[PDB]
Design a protein around this ligand. Structure first.
Ligand SMILES: Nc1ncnc2c1ncn2[C@@H]1O[C@H](COP(=O)(O)OP(=O)(O)O)[C@@H](O)[C@H]1O
Ligand code: BEF
Ligand SMILES: [Cl-]
Ligand SMILES: [Cl-]
Ligand SMILES: [Cl-]
Ligand SMILES: [Cl-]
Ligand SMILES: [Mg+2]
Length: 703
């Protein structure tokens, strides 16, 4: 009922309608600038759509005014309805939510934390006055876990929806479901780099509002030939920009903390050289990555240094960041973007059930976002450190959905916590294949994380609290019953990261020698345990651990990761009251306890020797024929083994293997190894003979 014209008349008022205070002069300067933005040209057109459709897809160039202006339009449109509900707008990163919340607070001439606020994990900058809240996807999902209808919100705006992250996809599915339940909820989906028709079609053929035009141009430059060392090329480019180009700050995208710190060091040294030798201007260098404290991350916004003298070469700021700065941000002063074209992206190893990070080429959408960090408040330039043909033909359009690159059992437990009942038909934008989902559900049911009705069990609920493959979580939770929760804590942590063994082709012998120091003849899990213990022991002596790992042919990266994970898991166990126990090393049962404890998590990954006449084993699951992997430390594999990994190469192997006793299977997983209903075959026969041996032995003793 209220038009863009009426709203504009209210915005022009001397009085702030939200607070009753006089509007400041800064407010009016900002308003004057705001009304020149592309999106403004279609405000009414937006309102119309917003009025006549529950869900709409909104696309417009980077910097066109989506994130700052659309929620304010909605704000002016919504609150006469007296609903007492909020408008939510989700950003990919916390620094983005905070930054844009401060900006919009400025635009509305209110205090941040009051009428405009933000919500991120560990910090809720909102109050009773809050009408518009910027938050992360994850935060909104965490709220959705306690409020399935999301009753606090009248409108939810999924920003940067092109980022197919786990949180984004799950949110989109939940919201698509909820839109059928709540007709008083509005949903806006927006991005500059979106597959519009895909998203429209997904949201019940929602309408599209497409806004043309850029505030400022961004000139794109490509390299004439490919260059392998992207770090050196990036540093060289930054230095050349500082030496030759006019005033303007630089945003360089790199892939990780260590790389970024090293690059910052090198850049700073070279800059010092240029200064003392060639009258170059000063340049401040800011690292930016996720493990930095958020308020320390906000340091990237401070002003570049002044020139050394009047008429001197410009002072400059250089931000060296991960894709934490790829979207959403307006860093005023930025003129140059340097895009090497790489980022750390999640991969999932289905044989080891391990999620890790791999430096990979970015998508076209990501490149466009990165470039879009410039051309917001002034013209910009983007130096892509790759050829135009490599952009046009080698880069994928959109990054593959994270849900298809993640541990699906984990995701399933999370979805159960979110109130999702039918997972087989859960309408994701890009669902895993029905068989993959069925496999996850099957495994979780056997692990007793889901009951036979498919409902979450207390064990499943507790397991979901751990950043682990659910089998590992169940193993850890169960470990106090085997009197070895410290060792299982360690082993779980190690099994949550990639292989720690390093075996270069030119030094394999030496590698083997070092590995021999940790080798346990009864199990690879125990060898892992030993390696970790040696690592911590060397660390306690105060040794250089990068050096130590290098000389022992162990991965410092993965061991360090596992150590951090262990700390986290320990904290969680202590929070939920799980006992942290160790059996004295010289106890007769010390190793048998641990070997038994493995079966609480891996009773479904067990293999039986076919004959004494051969070295072939058959897996309990799917009856596969395998060999024990030749990298094992198990010198004489038992008739029964537990294994971590199925390996398919020239031959079929099981890798990371520990000797077990068959009676342990019947004791520890009696429901799975229920012989009255177990599959007929040689494995069932062997287990039947084991059970009968135990029975005969007990009947005789009882007599
Ligand atoms: N913190 C800020 N400082 C200065 N100008 C800003 C700031 N945030 C936004 N702007 C101006 O408003 C424009 C729109 O920003 P935004 O709404 O974030 O665009 P989009 O979400 O479409 O990328 C920017 O291009 C810039 O001109
Ligand atoms: F599309 Be914008 F840069 F958030
Ligand atoms: Cl974040
Ligand atoms: Cl967060
Ligand atoms: Cl600094
Ligand atoms: Cl990061
Ligand atoms: Mg935006």
């Amino acid at each position: 009922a209220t038009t863009a014209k009426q709203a504009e008349a209210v915005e022009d008022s001397d009085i702030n309608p939200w607070t009753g205070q006089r509007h400041s002069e800064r407010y009016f300067k900002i308003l004057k600038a705001r009304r020149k933005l592309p999106v403004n040209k279609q405000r009414q057109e937006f309102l119309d759509l917003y009025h006549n459709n529950q869900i709409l897809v909104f696309v417009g160039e980077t910097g066109s005014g989506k994130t700052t202006q659309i929620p304010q339009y909605v704000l002016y449109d919504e609150l006469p309805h007296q609903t007492g509900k909020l408008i939510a707008c989700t950003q990919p990163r916390r620094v983005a939510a905070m930054s844009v919340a401060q900006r919009v607070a400025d635009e509305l001439d209110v205090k941040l934390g009051e009428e405009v606020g933000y919500s991120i994990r560990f910090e809720n900058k909102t109050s009773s006055k809050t009408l518009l809240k910027y938050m992360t996807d994850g935060q909104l999902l965490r709220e959705a876990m306690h409020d399935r209808d999301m009753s606090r919100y009248s409108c939810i705006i999924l920003d940067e929806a092109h980022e197919r992250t786990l949180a984004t996809d799950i949110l989109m599915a939940l919201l698509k479901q909820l839109s059928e339940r709540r007709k008083d909820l509005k949903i806006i989906v927006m991005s500059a780099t979106l597959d519009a028709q895909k998203f429209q079609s997904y949201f019940f053929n929602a309408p599209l509002l497409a806004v043309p035009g850029r505030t400022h141009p961004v000139e794109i430059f490509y390299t004439p030939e490919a260059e392998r060392d992207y770090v050196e090329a990036a540093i060289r480019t930054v230095l050349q920009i500082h030496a030759c180009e006019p005033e303007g700050d630089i945003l360089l995208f790199l892939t990780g903390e260590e790389e970024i710190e090293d690059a910052c060091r090198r850049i700073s040294l070279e800059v010092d050289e240029m200064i003392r030798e060639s009258d170059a201007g000063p340049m401040s260098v800011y690292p930016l990555y996720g493990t930095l404290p958020p308020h320390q991350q906000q340091r990237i916004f401070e002003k570049a240094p002044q020139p050394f003298r009047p008429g001197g070469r410009p002072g400059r700021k250089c931000i060296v960041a991960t894709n934490i700065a790829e979207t959403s941000l307006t860093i005023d002063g930025i003129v140059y973007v340097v895009d090497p074209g790489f980022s750390k992206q999640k991969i999932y190893n289905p044989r080891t059930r391990v999620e890790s990070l791999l430096v990979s080429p970015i998508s076209k959408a990501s490149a466009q976002q990165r470039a879009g960090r410039a051309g917001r408040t002034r013209p910009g330039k983007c130096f892509r450190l790759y050829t135009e043909e490599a952009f046009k033909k080698e880069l994928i359009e959109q990054t593959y959905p994270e849900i298809l690159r993640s541990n699906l059992s984990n995701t399933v437990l999370e979805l159960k916590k979110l109130g999702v009942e039918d997972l087989v038909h859960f309408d994701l934008m890009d669902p895993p294949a029905p068989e993959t989902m069925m496999r996850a559900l099957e495994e979780l049911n056997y692990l007793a994380c889901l009951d036979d009705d498919g409902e979450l069990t207390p064990l499943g609920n507790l397991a979901s609290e751990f950043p682990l493959d659910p089998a590992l979580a169940v193993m850890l939770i169960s470990s106090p019953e085997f009197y070895c929760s410290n060792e299982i804590l360690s082993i779980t942590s190690l099994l949550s990261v990639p292989q720690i063994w390093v075996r270069p082709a030119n030094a394999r012998k030496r590698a083997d020698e070092m590995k021999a120091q940790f080798a346990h003849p009864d199990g690879d899990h125990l060898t892992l345990l030993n390696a970790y213990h040696a690592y911590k022991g060397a660390e306690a002596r105060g040794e250089d651990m990068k050096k130590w790992c290098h000389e022992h042919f162990l991965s410092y990266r993965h061991l360090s990761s596992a150590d951090n994970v262990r700390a986290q898991l320990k904290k969680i166990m202590e929070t939920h009251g799980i006992e942290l126990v160790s059996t004295p090393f010289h106890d007769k049962n010390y190793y048998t306890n641990i070997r038994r404890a493995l079966l609480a998590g891996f009773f479904m990954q067990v293999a039986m020797r076919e004959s004494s006449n051969s070295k072939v084993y058959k897996t309990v699951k799917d009856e596969q024929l395998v060999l024990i992997h030749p990298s094992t430390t198990v010198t004489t594999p038992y008739e029964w083994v537990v294994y971590n990994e199925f390996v398919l190469t020239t031959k079929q192997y099981v890798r990371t293997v520990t000797n077990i006793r068959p009676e342990w299977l019947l004791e520890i997983a009696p429901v799975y190894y229920d012989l009255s209903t177990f599959q007929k075959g040689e494995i069932k026969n062997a287990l039947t003979r084991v059970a009968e041996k135990i029975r005969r032995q007990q009947a005789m003793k009882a007599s």
